[PDB]
Design a protein around this ligand. Structure first.
Ligand SMILES: [Zn+2]
Ligand SMILES: [Zn+2]
Ligand SMILES: [Zn+2]
Ligand SMILES: [Zn+2]
Ligand SMILES: [Zn+2]
Ligand SMILES: [Zn+2]
Ligand SMILES: [Zn+2]
Ligand SMILES: [Zn+2]
Lengths: 346, 337, 337, 337
């Protein structure tokens, strides 16, 4: 809170809870997260549309450059590939799932829209996919099918949002529901921006930035931004130079990841904005990873693109960890950016 | 069927080995006191619930301790290092949520993670603290005990998933036996034992004080009736009945008792299966070596994924266990050495 | 049943990625032209066959390129070194006969062998030449394309063995669909795509030019219903129907289209099975990402021993694929996103 | 401070497990007899020193056995083969001098060496004999016991190096407690136990005979506060106080006792640290399982290089241990279950 002390709510807890707990595996975002996004953003924009692959495009009209801001609403999960004779389920990953995060875990097996049954992940006696299975308490293939399970059924971890200490949280899918949360807050806080703004909750980031590619083509923005998580490996046993970002040290301004080298004018501009407005920030370089920005910048004849990231520990698990001060800083910098973008010269 | 709300109370109370007084002890006392003549807590914390009767003196032990973790060190940036309480596998700790018990009835959340299969030196817990001092201000100390954040849920028509079915499913079982039992020709001591998971310690001391004529343990046993397990290595099958223990690594159950239990199960059409473990150990291993020897048997609830936050059990096997134990207590006056 | 003579023509025409104009292109044009309003060949060599109709614009893609080899070097004693075109496994080249394409409709035989498990540095082709000069005299150059010496044959009552069922079985399919289709409420573009095996390249460019409302790919999918494969890893079974693609590594098919395809199959009693690939990739991976997005589905022909001179397919699955695609096109005007 | 000459007597007396009667037993009796009402030696050789008082009966155990070697074989050229008594690491035996005990109060020197990391089959002792017969003439037999040739010396301002600080530092501690203690409201049994190093055997049998209301062990604990040890694995630090044992592999100390000891140390400003061992074992592991159970705690002297001829201890931690144990005995009458 420490400038000339400011009072901030920092994160709207009930709203964050809504967004992290709606199911929305890649390709199947329509099952939960889509409608949560539409309901929570529609009042703050002039127009909401969902496009052909299911991207939610929320348009706030203004006189200025066309700006796209993308936050992916898909989460990683599992799909049922086979139902064994004794009712056990075999699975394939949707997105980059590590088998070791599935062992002795509870799951929500989505048998219909707004309907799940519990499952337990286990391995055949380190584990790879051939060894992983899900127990739903069925005794036979017939019983599992009776229960609503089919080849193609989608599954997420059973995770809920909880507080960790004074400023931190644990949850499923902070990647990238924390950014979906962020653009919802930007949408509320943005007023009279000299910018033609397109908030996009993208589909299928986790399987290759697919939703960002097609929505960016449709929108044809002058400038693009992604908001995603980035690695915070500020944990025991990590060399300082490999920590990438630190929790609570601010919003992360992306210099580059494996999918994008952010436009250096935009990188410099965002840093100077953060400095001017005393918003906590840190500079982000990812040796791997990839974000929607990787697709946006390559749209048509090219789009100058930047990115802000929320540092997150334990990415791609049921127990991702984020710091509310970094989330606050991200909302603020993005807001300031959109209010100042009519001045940006490239 | 099972009494779902009772089962929930029993599995969700905290009570790691040595620290059972922090939750589970009071649940057992509260739930059993009305069905027995006397309840006592002994020097190591065993709950000894006595139902007077005319017949042989019988001890039935269900261990109330669960496996868990203890804080060994608080790192400079507020992360916790831990030691196992009981047989914990590190691979069950990664990307899991925990309840970090800062007082009786008070917890904060924690997250399990590893340093870049994992061994103990690579395991740590994140509680959202920024420094050692902050962790300490939040109430964490060397010796703080920790359990998984687990809750009871239903799986399909007859099954359940929970933390600590090992051995709260047996604690639940003896509560039901106590409720059901009336005018048995037996002098019955129901014992919720402490510190089974660190070497059958509470059973040893309680059995000594009680000096029973006959002993029984109720515990989980391995159900490895899961994909990729050879049939001969499945041990028990969920839904195929209560498991009558022939032997485990800690006890060869008295063959007269084993046969008598099987004949009772056959005579009352109680579903059962015969259990042999090549490893493991149960309170029966302490009971039978009490003083000059105690003829001892054991019943087990088949359980999948033992020693994890996601243990799985079948209500039909639980009911069969309650039923067979009740019939055993009702008929033990007729058993001869 | 299948039109065996038509199948034979399509599988035996050469058409390695980037060099489809050497054989398969003209076969496709010759065999489809009478059943559509217009056939064009585009800049990269895709064959686009257009059947005008009143309804949504639909692209159906079957790749006409096959995997093969290209000559990288002619050794002093006349042996050839090669590079793969598409995903070629070197172990499928050993002690095999090849057709070394020296011109359009002209070849010399070759023999694959390894230098005393094999990688590419060990593979060479023997064409019976004694020197580099003799090899060149025979028409071989750096860049010369090579296919297996393969032919279509029958296996038992319903099955076939052939070179390039991937993806000539789908080229065969769209030819049959073109013949069957009448008065459809759809503007239809059958596309024999180039260079799928090197990264879905022709599908990308042809899809951009067509700008379809809906997209479909027809390709082979893994049938690993063979000895030693766990049931859960078999993917599809031969003779159990056309495979409706849910996802592969290149596409998650639109769920509305997946459901609609399944309901059509049920309605018309067409045999089907649901396909999930953990790897792979098909033209659908390029089509759905065209411009602002294209809702896309796929049907697959189950095939054993994919990417070899002995790929195996079931006529019943091929018939089911023809029938379902036809029903799809006749019914797509009713489909709503 | 410590009483240096007393400490020297205690660490330098021979007394390997089972053979404590050869030196250490008589030292303990001589040094304690004047400060207690009665001293008795029991059937396995435990020294039981009883100070009568009005209050709870308290057993305090410090093990007088040290690790060592026993002669298994005399080779043709006079070399000795050995078996370990207690947890001896062979790498602590190479290029070391030994006292080979040929009678009570009589020794000859020996030298440890290995055959060309080393295991037991490679270890031998050279006593300067030329033949088996000469070794035998010198008094060596199968069963001869052997200790390192170690003596107490000072290291810097507050530290010491010695053979057998494990557990002669605790033997020294109970002698000082006995000297200091006067008119305590407690019925005190100081026990110098036998055969701790081979499985807590003397503590088990003495605790049974005594039947105490409360038990305490005093032993060394790991101080790995040395170069290259991660902070979370140091366990205790020399000079940072007496270690209050929360748990080791043999005992989870009674939490009421653990907390009470910490509060006493805080109330009297006695430096202390909290101890958790993931392995190890102490007499407390036998004491608490006596009969119907005995609430038990433990204090430890941090020690570096445990189980060697060069164990290291800090006098400030020793003094704190004496002080806390004295305050515990003086205040135990107030402790409630
Ligand atoms: Zn991700
Ligand atoms: Zn992401
Ligand atoms: Zn257990
Ligand atoms: Zn158990
Ligand atoms: Zn193909
Ligand atoms: Zn292919
Ligand atoms: Zn020792
Ligand atoms: Zn010791």
């Amino acid at each position: 809170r420490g400038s000339h002390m400011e009072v901030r709510n920092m994160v709207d807890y009930e709203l964050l809870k809504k967004v992290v707990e709606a199911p929305g595996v890649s390709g199947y975002e329509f099952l939960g997260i889509r409608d949560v996004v539409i309901e929570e953003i529609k009042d703050y924009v002039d127009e909401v549309k969902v496009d052909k692959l299911g991207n939610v495009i929320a348009h706030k009209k203004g006189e200025g450059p066309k700006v796209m801001i993308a936050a992916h609403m898909d989460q990683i999960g599992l799909m049922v590939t086979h139902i064994e004779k004794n009712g056990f389920l075999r699975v394939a990953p949707i997105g980059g799932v590590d088998p070791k995060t599935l062992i002795a875990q509870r799951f929500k097996v989505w048998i219909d829209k707004g309907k799940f049954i519990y499952g337990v992940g286990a391995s055949v006696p380190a584990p790879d996919w051939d060894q992983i299975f899900i127990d739903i308490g069925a005794e036979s293939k017939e019983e599992a099918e009776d229960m609503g399970v089919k080849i193609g059924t989608v599954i997420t971890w059973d995770g809920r949002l909880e507080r960790l200490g004074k400023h931190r949280f644990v949850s499923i899918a902070f990647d990238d529901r924390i950014a979906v949360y962020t653009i919802l807050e930007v949408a509320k806080q943005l007023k009279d921006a000299k910018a033609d703004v397109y908030f996009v909750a993208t589909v299928q980031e986790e399987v290759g930035l697919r939703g960002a590619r097609t929505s960016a083509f449709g929108i044809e923005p002058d400038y693009g931004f992604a908001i995603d998580v980035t690695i915070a490996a500020d944990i025991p046993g990590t060399p300082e130079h490999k920590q990438v970002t630190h929790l609570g040290k601010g919003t992360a301004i992306k210099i580059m990841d494996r999918s994008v080298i952010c436009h250096p004018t935009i990188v410099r501009w965002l840093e100077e904005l953060a400095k001017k407005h005393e918003i906590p920030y840190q500079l982000e370089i990812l040796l791997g990873g990839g974000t929607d920005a990787g697709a946006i910048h390559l749209t048509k004849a090219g789009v100058p693109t930047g990115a802000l990231s929320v540092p997150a520990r334990y990415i791609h698990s049921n127990t991702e960890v984020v710091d509310e001060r970094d989330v606050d800083a991200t909302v603020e910098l993005m807001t300031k950016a959109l209010e100042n973008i009519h001045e940006l010269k490239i």
